[PDB]
Ligand binder design. Structure first.
Ligand SMILES: CCCCCCCCCCCCCCCCCC(=O)OC[C@H](COP(=O)([O-])OCC[N+](C)(C)C)OC(=O)CCCCCCCCCCCCCCCCC
Ligand SMILES: CCCCCCCCCCCCCCCCCC(=O)OC[C@H](COP(=O)([O-])OCC[N+](C)(C)C)OC(=O)CCCCCCCCCCCCCCCCC
Ligand SMILES: CCCCCCCCCCCCCCCCCC(=O)OC[C@H](COP(=O)([O-])OCC[N+](C)(C)C)OC(=O)CCCCCCCCCCCCCCCCC
Ligand SMILES: CCCCCCCCCCCCCCCCCC(=O)OC[C@H](COP(=O)([O-])OCC[N+](C)(C)C)OC(=O)CCCCCCCCCCCCCCCCC
Ligand SMILES: CCCCCCCCCCCCCCCCCC(=O)OC[C@H](COP(=O)(O)OCCN)OC(=O)CCCCCCCCCCCCCCCCC
Ligand SMILES: CCCCCCCCCCCCCCCCCC(=O)OC[C@H](COP(=O)(O)OCCN)OC(=O)CCCCCCCCCCCCCCCCC
Ligand SMILES: CCCCCCCCCCCCCCCCCC(=O)OC[C@H](COP(=O)(O)OCCN)OC(=O)CCCCCCCCCCCCCCCCC
Ligand code: SF4
Lengths: 171, 318, 67, 155, 115, 72, 98, 83
């Protein structure tokens, strides 16, 4: 329980590690739908249920296109991804041993407090709201329409122009 | 005492789905002037057990040209999700109430795609690559609308919690305020849940058993167990979001009892469709749904924004 | 005739009432004859975790009669 | 007792395979027309748990209607060698059993049985749709009387 | 925690149902039923070549709108602001420029399946 | 003698009554509803199927099947 | 909170370590560029969600409207890399140094 | 007119979708400007006491609501009732 988010966090670092080794874009895309899901857990492990689901709505319909084009532009006769060579599988297993190494190194140097495996799980929320109402996220994201209505025009204009910026690149 | 609730939540939907395989063969039959199953049981009540027990004895094809890891995970991922969407689905009081209990549906509804993409991509075959690609431009088509047809309804409701609509519908069905939404929702409940008049993905006649052709019996059932399990959700939602049955909280089994009466119609309404209409050729479906529904959606999306502020009808955040 | 369809429906029709009517009677048994008492906000959780602390650790009980 | 349990399991294992057998969307000649009239509202397959699925991986029996030419023959055993192997076969017609007409032509195999092994043979030039239906009811008991767990116990 | 009790199950209900599908059929896998299908012939090409789609531009307009959809989703809470006149306007401004962005593409032959 | 099958196009300056007549065919897609009621007209019919081994369909005295050698 | 951000900063870096070492695909580098964004979404949300800085909660979406609009322009160039070559290999575009 | 008003007649016969969209668009922004009840949306939404109303301290001033809630002074919304 106390070791909840350190697990969700290290399974994210790994979901972004194999993502960095650059297998075929499918098993990288799979490597991001996972880490995007895992991102919905820790964002939600610290409160707001909205923001986590968003990543887990964008980068589903995001990676649904990444499945489409890779079948048309980015794909070999043989994908040759993870269980296909030993150059990736070494630096996929020695990245994880480097992880268990490194985090276990600097709990010995428990002076900067970058990780405190003994003082773990006890510092995650920091005095939230206990008696309270109308506090969740989505009240903040809805400031696009009150008191932060410039985040709104500036991002809407990007999508108004993306629709024109994109076709002149195809044409 | 919670496992005894899941046990009474998953058994009574895998045992229902099974008899939708039957009911999808008889109702279609009598329209075709042909009796369906009559023999294995009294009136075909015992045919899916044969069909089920038949499929877990045949050789699950491990094809020579494939990716045996994603091969096995897609049906694990299909039967998981569409079964796991029943968790917050509120017959009056749900197993798991959620504030964002409908974004849970949308997001997990989208992961039912990757069971169709990873399958046909893993399985080396032209007739399955297509069915994978046939879902890509299908999700691209409706998923813009399964949100806004679902937002603008939940815009004159408040929170995304599905439980609130039982109180929004305490005296009226939302079908009457939003029949335009309910029309396009019905078709968007029909593209998602690829079972359809426009199937386009398991096309027996074009793409024979698309996304599904290299799969033999063992893994094969987990899609039928997932597709016919998902037919009942997206009608069960229409019996919550648009057709609001009776709450009256001293007999909560009146909700669940009228929830039955409409969900079977909307589950029996899909059955008239497959026996009544052909497919959209896969270029119309995205010309039928970015051109005709998408503008008409944004309009009513805009109308229901200026519906309460025009009048007063602001949903409360309880 | 068409009446041979009703078994496929009215056996499917004694199969989707259970997850609705079982979901309540299983709550009332666990929650003490009350409803599950869902908590959407941080206030309704405080009342629980208060009422959890005015009794034995189960929170579906004691009220007036005390002082 | 063990044998009695295994005979009933082997009688109960077959009830599924024989009721819900999914034939395969074959064709090739006139004979296939009668299969449609066996999908028709007179002699319904679906009433017998018999369903057209147009892929072998989903199939449980091949129904060979029509002249099995020499060009089609690789495509007939490339297909029979794509099912799982409770797979069964049915040879509709006299063009598929022996090549009735065209027994002496050069581009016709003189029997489906030259190539794929067969469980049952339906005769008739166009066998009546109530004569495949007698065959796929007879194939439906030809593996009611298979003993695949019995001969495992005594082995 | 209560949901992990629901969903680890459904993996097991799937994972326990798949192990009883590979280890209880009595298989006979040799060579020619494992190899791919293409309707009774040996496939010409290798099944994993460039597909060259034709809806390439619409997939991007979706890729832009899934943001825009996400950029709508806080409206059920935005109406519970005290202003409800910038939320009024700025909700019209977002939906309008979208349809303008959608109508420009609609005329300039974006969603038309290049061919 | 020949008969045109698809030839009716003639712009009669369609009055606003003939527009809704067309604009409610669309926006309620009702031409299809005339098909759903058409299949609803058949589940309530008697399915023509027959229990085969107990109800073997009709033949005629010239139906030629299995050969046989008659005898005086 | 001070166990993930070292673990998320270290997840940004591996993706920065990935989108500088290529492997013969332009479309796996664009792909590695979105998980780069993603660690900044989360390492921005939490900071805006343990501090209860709801006023900054509009930011983790504005960051992300430019995560797909940049990918959109990114994906659309592959259409114009493919239509020259049809292969999408980064080693195939070297005729500018001339 | 005729050269504009009768163009809408085919656009209502054929293309009978954009007419609704372009209408409901133009019919959405226009109605709150001619309403009797649009004033209340920023008022029914301003009455909700989500946060606690901090009381001031009496310093011989502000003849407002005294130290008594049911006292006729102050924002007594009888408009929400009897709307
Ligand atoms: C710390 C622990 C976290 C894990 C550290 C990394 C080690 C885990 C193994 C990853 C590498 C395995 C591999 O090579 O994958 C390719 C393999 C390749 O296999 P294949 O599909 O090509 O078929 C191989 C056929 N045989 C068996 C005959 C050789 O496929 C996969 O495993 C992909 C699935 C990845 C699983 C991760 C996603 C979670 C599940 C998604 C829901
Ligand atoms: C729940 C799943 C249980 C499935 C088996 C139930 C029996 C099925 C049945 O009614 O027919 C069985 C069959 C009878 O049905 P049948 O399939 O042999 O023939 C039906 C008759 N016609 C075609 C004319 C309509 O009885 C048996 O001989 C099977 C014996 C093994 C069953 C297990 C016994 C212990
Ligand atoms: C309804 C949904 C739930 C789905 C699950 C259904 C549950 C009910 C299933 C019960 C049936 C169990 C036995 C099926 C095994 C059939 C495969 C088979 O015939 O094996 C024969 C083989 C026979 O082996 P053999 O000795 O004849 O030689 C094998 C190879 N040949 C024949 C080619 C030489 O072994 C068995 O006897 C199967 C016993 C399995 C029992 C395990 C439990
Ligand atoms: C009781 C059993 C119900 C039977 C209903 C099935 C349809 C059969 C009726 C007969 C028929 O086909 O009429 C054809 C007729 C078609 O006749 P027509 O095609 O010859 O010409 C139509 C008339 N013009 C051309 C002028 C427009 O249908 C109609 O005319 C009116 C009905 C169409 C609109 C209905 C569908 C849209 C409504 C959706 C909103 C929700 C409806 C309520 C749903 C309840 C569930 C939530
Ligand atoms: C075969 C491959 C399978 C792998 C993929 C499986 C996909 C599963 C389906 C995806 C889930 C969709 C996203 C869920 C997000 C959580 C939904 C949510 O927002 O509500 C969570 C809820 C708290 O939210 P809320 O209720 O609104 O707060 C107020 C308090 N009532 O209550 C909570 O806080 C609970 C939140 C955590 C629940 C997450 C469930 C994770 C399940 C484990 C997945 C990994 C599988 C295990 C490993 C097996 C190996 C494969
Ligand atoms: C008072 C002032 C304020 C008022 C504001 C409100 C203004 C009024 C708004 C009116 C809205 C009208 C209805 C909106 C939906 C209409 C959608 C539509 O127009 O669909 C058109 C589409 C055809 O498009 P097109 O490509 O042009 O084809 C014709 C080519 N010759 O048609 C199609 O292609 C769809 C075909 C799909 C058919 C599938 C079968 C569906 C099965 C039906 C299930 C029946 C039960 C219904 C259940 C409903 C859900 C509860
Ligand atoms: C050691 C760290 C350096 C990076 C490791 C990978 C080696 C490299 O430089 O990447 C080269 C590779 C180029 O691509 P390519 O042309 O296909 O290479 C063919 C070579 N025959 O490009 C790549 O492979 C992409 C590299 C991304 C690497 C992301 C994962 C790095 C994790 C391992 C860190 C190193 C482990 C440290 C261990 C410490 C020991 C305690
Ligand atoms: S046996 Fe007769 S009906 Fe059958 S394929 Fe040959 S000619 Fe045609």
């Amino acid at each position: 329980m106390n070791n909840y988010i350190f697990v969700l966090s290290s399974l994210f670092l790994v979901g972004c590690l194999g993502l960095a080794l650059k297998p075929s874009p499918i098993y990288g895309g799979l490597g991001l739908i996972v880490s995007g899901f895992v991102g919905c857990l820790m964002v939600l492990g610290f409160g707001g249920s909205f923001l986590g689901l968003m990543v887990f709505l964008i980068y589903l319909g995001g990676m649904l296109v990444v499945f489409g084009y890779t079948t048309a532009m980015a794909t070999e006769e043989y994908p040759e991804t993870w269980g296909s060579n030993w150059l990736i599988l070494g630096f996929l297993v020695l990245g994880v041993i480097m992880e268990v190494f490194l985090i276990c190194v600097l709990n010995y140097y428990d002076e900067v407090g970058v990780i405190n495996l003994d003082g773990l799980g006890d510092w995650l929320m920091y005095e939230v709201d206990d008696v309270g109402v109308m506090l969740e996220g989505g009240i903040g994201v809805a400031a696009m329409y009150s008191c932060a209505t410039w985040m709104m025009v500036v991002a809407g204009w990007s999508l108004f122009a993306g629709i024109f910026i994109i076709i002149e690149i195809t044409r | 005492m919670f496992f005894i609730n899941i046990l009474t939540l998953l058994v009574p939907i895998l045992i229902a789905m099974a008899f939708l395989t039957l009911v999808e063969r008889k109702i279609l039959g009598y329209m075709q002037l042909r009796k369906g199953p009559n023999i294995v049981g009294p009136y075909g009540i015992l045919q899916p057990f044969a069909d089920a027990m038949k499929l877990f004895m045949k050789e699950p094809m491990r094809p020579l040209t494939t990716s045996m890891s994603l091969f096995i995970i897609a049906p694990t991922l299909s039967l998981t999700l569409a079964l796991s969407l029943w968790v917050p689905l509120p017959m009056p009081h749900p197993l798991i109430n959620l504030n964002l209990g409908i974004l849970f549906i949308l997001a997990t509804s989208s992961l039912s795609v990757y069971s169709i993409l990873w399958s046909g991509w893993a399985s080396n075959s032209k007739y399955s690559l297509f069915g994978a690609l046939r879902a890509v431009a299908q999700t691209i088509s409706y998923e813009v609308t399964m949100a806004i047809i679902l937002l603008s309804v939940l815009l004159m409701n408040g929170s995304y919690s599905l439980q609130t609509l039982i109180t929004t519908q305490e005296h009226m069905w939302l079908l009457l305020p939003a029949w335009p939404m309910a029309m396009m929702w019905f078709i968007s409940t029909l593209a998602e849940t690829n079972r359809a008049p426009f199937d386009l993905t398991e096309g027996e006649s074009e793409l024979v058993s698309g996304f599904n052709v290299e799969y033999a019996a063992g893994p094969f059932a987990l899609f039928f167990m997932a597709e016919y399990t998902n037919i009942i959700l997206m009608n069960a939602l229409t019996t919550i979001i648009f057709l609001g049955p009776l709450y009256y909280i001293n007999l909560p089994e009146l909700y669940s009892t009228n929830f039955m009466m409409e969900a079977l119609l909307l589950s029996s309404t899909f059955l008239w469709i497959r026996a009544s209409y052909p497919r959209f050729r896969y270029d119309q479906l995205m010309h039928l749904l970015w051109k005709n529904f998408l503008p008409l959606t944004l309009a009513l999306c805009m109308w229901h924004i200026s519906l309460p502020i025009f009048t007063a009808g602001v949903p409360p955040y309880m | 005739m068409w009446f041979e369809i009703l078994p496929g429906l009215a056996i499917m029709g004694v199969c989707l009432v259970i997850p609705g009517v079982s979901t309540a009677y299983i709550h009332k048994f666990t929650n003490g004859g009350k409803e599950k008492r869902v908590a959407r906000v941080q206030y309704q959780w405080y009342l629980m975790e208060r009422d959890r602390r005015i009794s034995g650790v189960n929170r579906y009980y004691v009220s007036k009669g005390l002082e | 007792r063990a044998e009695y349990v295994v005979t009933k399991l082997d009688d109960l294992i077959n009830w599924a395979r024989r009721s819900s057998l999914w034939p395969m969307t074959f064709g090739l000649a006139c004979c296939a027309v009668e299969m449609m009239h066996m999908a028709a509202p007179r002699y319904d397959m679906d009433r017998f748990g018999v369903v057209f699925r147009a892929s072998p991986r989903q199939a449980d029996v091949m129904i060979v209607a029509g002249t099995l030419t020499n060009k089609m023959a690789p495509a007939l055993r490339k297909v029979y060698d794509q099912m799982p192997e409770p797979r069964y076969v049915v040879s509709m017609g006299s063009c598929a059993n022996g090549g009735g007409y065209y027994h002496y032509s050069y581009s016709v195999v003189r029997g489906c049985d030259r190539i794929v092994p067969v469980d049952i043979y339906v005769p008739g030039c166009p066998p009546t749709a109530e004569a495949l239906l007698y065959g796929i009811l007879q194939l439906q008991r030809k593996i009611k009387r298979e003993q695949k767990l019995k001969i495992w116990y005594r082995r | 925690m209560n949901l992990y009790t629901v969903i680890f199950i459904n993996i097991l209900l799937s994972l326990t149902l798949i192990l009883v599908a590979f280890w209880l059929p009595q298989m006979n896998l040799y060579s020619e039923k494992a190899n791919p299908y293409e309707c009774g012939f040996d496939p010409t090409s290798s099944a994993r070549l460039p597909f060259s789609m034709k809806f390439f531009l619409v997939a991007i307009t979706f890729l832009l709108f899934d943001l825009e959809i996400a950029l709508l989703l806080p409206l059920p809470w935005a109406i519970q602001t005290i202003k409800t006149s910038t939320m009024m306007i700025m909700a019209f401004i977002l939906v309008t420029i979208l349809s303008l962005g959608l109508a420009y593409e609609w005329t300039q032959k974006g969603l038309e399946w290049t061919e | 003698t020949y008969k045109y099958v698809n030839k009716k196009e003639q712009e009669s300056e369609v009055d606003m009554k003939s527009a809704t007549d067309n604009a409610a065919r669309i926006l309620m897609w009702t031409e299809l509803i005339r098909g759903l009621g058409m299949t609803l007209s058949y589940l309530f019919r008697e399915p023509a199927t027959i229990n085969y081994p107990f109800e073997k369909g009709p033949l005629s005295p010239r139906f030629r099947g299995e050969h046989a050698l008659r005898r005086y | 909170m001070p166990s993930t951000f070292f673990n998320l900063t270290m997840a940004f870096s591996l993706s920065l370590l990935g989108t500088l070492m290529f492997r013969s695909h332009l479309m796996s580098t664009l792909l590695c560029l979105e998980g780069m964004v993603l660690s900044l979404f989360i390492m921005t949300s939490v900071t805006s969600l343990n501090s209860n800085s709801m006023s900054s909660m509009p930011i983790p979406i504005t960051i992300l409207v430019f995560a797909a609009c940049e990918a959109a322009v990114g994906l659309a160039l592959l259409v114009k890399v493919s239509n020259t070559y049809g292969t999408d290999y980064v080693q195939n575009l070297n005729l500018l140094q001339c | 007119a005729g050269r504009i008003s009768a163009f809408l007649k085919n656009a209502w016969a054929k293309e009978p979708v954009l007419v609704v969209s372009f209408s409901v668009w133009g019919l959405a922004i226009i109605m709150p400007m001619i309403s009797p009840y649009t004033k209340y949306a920023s008022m029914i939404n301003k009455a909700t006491p989500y946060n606690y109303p901090v009381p001031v301290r009496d310093d011989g001033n502000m003849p407002d609501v005294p130290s008594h809630p049911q006292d006729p002074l102050g924002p007594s919304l009888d408009w929400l009732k009897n709307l």
